[PDB]
Amino acid sequence: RPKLRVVTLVEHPFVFTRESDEDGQCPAGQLCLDPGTNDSARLDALFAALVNGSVPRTLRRCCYGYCIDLLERLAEDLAFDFELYIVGDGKYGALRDGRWTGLVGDLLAGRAHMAVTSFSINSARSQVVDFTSPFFSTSLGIMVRTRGTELSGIHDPKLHHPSQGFRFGTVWESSAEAYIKASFPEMHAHMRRHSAPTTPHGVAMLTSDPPKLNAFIMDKSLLDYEVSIDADCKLLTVGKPFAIEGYGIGLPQNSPLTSNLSEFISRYKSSGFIDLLHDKWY
């Protein structure tokens, strides 16, 4: 029964974490390591230390969420065991200085058998890693505060010729950022000084005092979740959808696992299991 090493990225409601119990175990959820490193030797050693060393609670979390439920079902149906860690840099992945970062970089470096989270399939990434057929689809979206900025979508002139003090941004090294860099390079030039390391950091810029963003661009799936948990219901998504992409499980090229995983994903879609996960987690 093979044991697969899975890299993830904490992004609500696809992957959440809570603290481990007194013994560093997870009565609810799945034990995930939080190593904070892309050093292959350190990663190997940390997993080894689970068995013959001592990994402190500061580096242990218990993962749960839509993608963890998905992973648990696939492990059952395909008969594999798994171990999880959170990607060190907290990024999905971009090509920077000739190397891929984030989840894409860990798959290429052989640090994980698969990457499981809200991971977008795009053409640049597909040239270097493989993805299963998608389990979920989302457009990008634009989040703003209520009672203020109005936008038609990505072609709004407010974004192409921003007025004095108008700021907008995305998440560094995300597929959202990749789409803008490729499609709207002049807009990217304005955004890259106002972007954020994670979705919650970007949403926080909209709500800071004073706000540091007037608009935040990210997967609509993720923005919709943040809209739903705002304590004041003061966030809103606006404009027409754009840049539709699927989420898939990422694997190194030519993995013997990809086909089998895709077959089950297709079955989960048709049988209504994927819809159940959505209803459960949203």
Binding residues for D-serine are: 120, 125, 175-176, 219
Residue 269: what residue type?
K
Q: Which two tokens stand for residue 254?
A: 């030519």
List Cα–Cα distances, 231 to 139, 207, 223, 235, 278, in angstroms: 25, 11, 14, 10, 22
C-alpha to C-alpha distance for 30 and 5, rounded to whole angstroms:
13
Q: Provide the annotated binding site.
A: 118, 120, 125, 175-176, 219
Q: Provide the annotated binding site for glycine.
A: 118, 120, 125, 175, 219
> DSSP for 192-233?
TTS-BSSHHHHHHHHHSSS-S-SEEEEEHHHHHHHHHH-TT-
The enclosing H or E element of 115 equals strand 114-115
C-alpha to C-alpha distance for 143 and 72, rounded to whole angstroms:
32
C-alpha to C-alpha distance for 162 and 187, rounded to whole angstroms:
9
Nearest to 46 by CA among 17, 115, 37: 37
